[PDB]
Design a protein around this motif. Structure first.
Motif, mmCIF file in Angstrom:
data_model
loop_
_atom_site.group_PDB
_atom_site.id
_atom_site.type_symbol
_atom_site.label_atom_id
_atom_site.label_comp_id
_atom_site.label_asym_id
_atom_site.label_seq_id
_atom_site.Cartn_x
_atom_site.Cartn_y
_atom_site.Cartn_z
ATOM 1 N N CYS A 9 0.452 -1.486 0.116
ATOM 2 C CA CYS A 9 0.226 0.063 0.151
ATOM 3 C C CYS A 9 0.772 0.920 -0.521
ATOM 4 C CB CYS A 9 -1.174 0.148 1.490
ATOM 5 S SG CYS A 9 -2.539 -0.814 1.218
ATOM 6 N N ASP A 10 0.046 2.179 -0.057
ATOM 7 C CA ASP A 10 0.974 3.220 -0.052
ATOM 8 C C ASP A 10 0.135 4.360 1.045
ATOM 9 O OD1 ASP A 10 2.901 5.194 -1.560
ATOM 10 O OD2 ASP A 10 2.571 3.168 -2.519
ATOM 11 N N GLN A 11 -1.185 5.207 0.635
ATOM 12 C CA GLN A 11 -2.515 5.759 1.161
ATOM 13 C C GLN A 11 -2.868 5.094 2.319
ATOM 14 O OE1 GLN A 11 -1.335 7.417 -2.017
ATOM 15 N NE2 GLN A 11 0.225 7.575 -0.277
ATOM 16 N N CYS A 12 -4.138 5.284 2.827
ATOM 17 C CA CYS A 12 -4.331 5.040 4.285
ATOM 18 C C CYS A 12 -6.301 5.181 4.480
ATOM 19 C CB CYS A 12 -3.792 4.168 5.544
ATOM 20 S SG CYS A 12 -3.600 2.549 5.597
ATOM 21 N N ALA A 13 -7.088 4.799 4.434
ATOM 22 C CA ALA A 13 -8.339 6.263 4.755
ATOM 23 C C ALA A 13 -9.538 4.302 5.344
ATOM 24 C CB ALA A 13 -8.840 7.113 3.354
ATOM 25 N N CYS A 14 -9.495 5.529 6.550
ATOM 26 C CA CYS A 14 -10.753 4.179 6.725
ATOM 27 C C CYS A 14 -12.355 4.928 8.052
ATOM 28 C CB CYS A 14 -10.475 3.250 8.027
ATOM 29 S SG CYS A 14 -8.620 1.980 8.073
ATOM 30 N N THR A 15 -13.295 4.829 7.661
ATOM 31 C CA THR A 15 -13.859 5.468 7.394
ATOM 32 C C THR A 15 -14.897 4.438 9.131
ATOM 33 O OG1 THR A 15 -16.813 5.480 7.043
ATOM 34 C CG2 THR A 15 -15.754 3.847 5.676
ATOM 35 N N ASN A 18 -19.601 -0.572 10.757
ATOM 36 C CA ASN A 18 -20.253 -1.730 11.786
ATOM 37 C C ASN A 18 -20.209 -2.452 10.562
ATOM 38 O OD1 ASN A 18 -20.756 0.107 14.608
ATOM 39 N ND2 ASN A 18 -21.273 -2.620 14.545
ATOM 40 N N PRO A 19 -19.143 -3.897 10.946
ATOM 41 C CA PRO A 19 -17.609 -3.329 11.683
ATOM 42 C C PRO A 19 -17.227 -1.675 10.740
ATOM 43 C CG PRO A 19 -17.361 -5.370 10.627
ATOM 44 C CD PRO A 19 -19.284 -4.762 10.824
ATOM 45 N N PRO A 20 -15.854 -1.292 10.928
ATOM 46 C CA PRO A 20 -16.004 -0.143 10.907
ATOM 47 C C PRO A 20 -15.034 -0.751 9.122
ATOM 48 C CG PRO A 20 -13.872 -0.654 12.392
ATOM 49 C CD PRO A 20 -15.611 -2.007 12.494
ATOM 50 N N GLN A 21 -14.992 0.448 8.354
ATOM 51 C CA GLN A 21 -14.540 -0.627 6.080
ATOM 52 C C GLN A 21 -13.184 0.492 6.586
ATOM 53 O OE1 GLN A 21 -17.086 1.094 3.710
ATOM 54 N NE2 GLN A 21 -18.160 -0.713 3.645
ATOM 55 N N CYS A 22 -12.307 -0.070 5.532
ATOM 56 C CA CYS A 22 -10.831 0.461 5.450
ATOM 57 C C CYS A 22 -10.471 0.468 3.950
ATOM 58 C CB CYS A 22 -9.879 -0.018 6.125
ATOM 59 S SG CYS A 22 -10.084 0.098 7.931
ATOM 60 N N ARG A 23 -10.068 1.724 3.808
ATOM 61 C CA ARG A 23 -9.798 1.650 1.632
ATOM 62 C C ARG A 23 -8.353 1.854 2.184
ATOM 63 N NH1 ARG A 23 -13.839 3.473 -2.599
ATOM 64 N NH2 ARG A 23 -14.211 3.481 -0.509
ATOM 65 N N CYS A 24 -7.695 1.686 1.899
ATOM 66 C CA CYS A 24 -6.642 1.518 1.826
ATOM 67 C C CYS A 24 -5.428 1.977 0.031
ATOM 68 C CB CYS A 24 -5.387 0.592 1.998
ATOM 69 S SG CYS A 24 -3.468 1.245 1.929
ATOM 70 N N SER A 25 -4.795 1.993 -0.244
ATOM 71 C CA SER A 25 -4.068 2.813 -1.398
ATOM 72 C C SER A 25 -5.362 3.463 -2.540
ATOM 73 C CB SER A 25 -3.357 1.592 -2.308
ATOM 74 O OG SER A 25 -2.722 1.592 -2.974
ATOM 75 N N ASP A 26 -5.967 3.896 -1.773
ATOM 76 C CA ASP A 26 -6.782 4.854 -2.151
ATOM 77 C C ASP A 26 -6.865 5.256 -3.825
ATOM 78 O OD1 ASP A 26 -7.482 4.682 0.133
ATOM 79 O OD2 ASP A 26 -8.617 6.309 0.292
ATOM 80 N N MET A 27 -5.818 6.490 -3.958
ATOM 81 C CA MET A 27 -5.284 7.224 -5.303
ATOM 82 C C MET A 27 -4.358 6.865 -5.490
ATOM 83 S SD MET A 27 -5.971 9.186 -2.688
ATOM 84 C CE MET A 27 -5.769 10.973 -2.504
ATOM 85 N N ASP A 56 -10.256 -4.489 6.563
ATOM 86 C CA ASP A 56 -10.670 -3.957 7.487
ATOM 87 C C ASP A 56 -9.366 -3.445 8.360
ATOM 88 O OD1 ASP A 56 -12.332 -6.387 6.393
ATOM 89 O OD2 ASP A 56 -13.708 -4.889 7.854
ATOM 90 N N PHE A 57 -8.204 -3.192 7.915
ATOM 91 C CA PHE A 57 -6.711 -3.308 8.192
ATOM 92 C C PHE A 57 -5.884 -1.848 8.078
ATOM 93 C CE2 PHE A 57 -7.908 -7.713 7.056
ATOM 94 C CZ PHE A 57 -6.740 -7.469 5.735
ATOM 95 N N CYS A 58 -6.639 -2.127 6.805
ATOM 96 C CA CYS A 58 -5.030 -0.957 6.055
ATOM 97 C C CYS A 58 -4.225 -2.018 5.914
ATOM 98 C CB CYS A 58 -5.053 0.310 6.555
ATOM 99 S SG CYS A 58 -5.604 1.567 5.468
ATOM 100 N N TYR A 59 -3.493 -2.358 4.497
ATOM 101 C CA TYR A 59 -2.534 -2.580 4.511
ATOM 102 C C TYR A 59 -1.275 -2.332 4.124
ATOM 103 C CZ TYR A 59 -6.656 -4.457 0.940
ATOM 104 O OH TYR A 59 -7.671 -5.025 0.792
ATOM 105 N N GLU A 60 -0.608 -2.590 5.526
ATOM 106 C CA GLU A 60 0.320 -1.005 5.722
ATOM 107 C C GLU A 60 1.111 -0.495 4.462
ATOM 108 O OE1 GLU A 60 1.236 -4.402 7.960
ATOM 109 O OE2 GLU A 60 3.551 -3.434 8.980
ATOM 110 N N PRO A 61 2.430 0.022 4.784
ATOM 111 C CA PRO A 61 2.543 0.772 3.338
ATOM 112 C C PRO A 61 3.319 -0.416 2.875
ATOM 113 C CG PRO A 61 3.401 1.774 5.656
ATOM 114 C CD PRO A 61 2.678 0.876 5.603
ATOM 115 N N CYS A 62 3.894 0.513 1.360
ATOM 116 C CA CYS A 62 5.120 -0.205 0.746
ATOM 117 C C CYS A 62 6.491 -0.402 1.370
ATOM 118 C CB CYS A 62 5.040 0.116 -1.116
ATOM 119 S SG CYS A 62 4.545 -1.442 -2.100
ATOM 120 N N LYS A 63 7.717 -1.730 0.999
ATOM 121 C CA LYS A 63 8.505 -1.727 1.140
ATOM 122 C C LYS A 63 8.795 -2.498 3.128
ATOM 123 C CE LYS A 63 11.018 0.175 -1.743
ATOM 124 N NZ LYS A 63 12.470 -0.001 -1.827
ATOM 125 N N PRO A 64 8.750 -3.155 2.369
ATOM 126 C CA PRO A 64 8.157 -4.102 4.312
ATOM 127 C C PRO A 64 10.326 -3.674 4.279
ATOM 128 C CG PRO A 64 7.836 -5.324 2.649
ATOM 129 C CD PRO A 64 8.224 -4.236 2.304
#
Length: 71
Positions: A9-15, A18-27, A56-64
């Protein structure tokens, strides 16, 4: 987890839902890849892309790295 093509991933955004949602690598001002579900993309300049995939957890940024923080 299979090959090294793990969806990063790169970007991270959750809302708050119930349960919460989470879209990562948005744009992305370029193009996505085959690591999402379905990415929308405008093959027009300026190139543009979006990943409508959500988790439901937002993948971590790239380059682990085990040096930073990963137990």
């Amino acid at each position: 987890d299979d090959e090294s093509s793990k969806p990063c991933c790169d970007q991270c955004a959750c809302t708050k839902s119930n349960p919460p949602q989470c879209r990562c690598s948005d744009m992305r001002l370029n193009s996505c890849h085959s690591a999402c579900k379905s990415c929308i993309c405008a093959l027009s300049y300026p190139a543009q892309c979006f990943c409508v995939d959500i988790t439901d957890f937002c993948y971590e940024p790239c380059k682990p790295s085990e040096d930073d923080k990963e137990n």
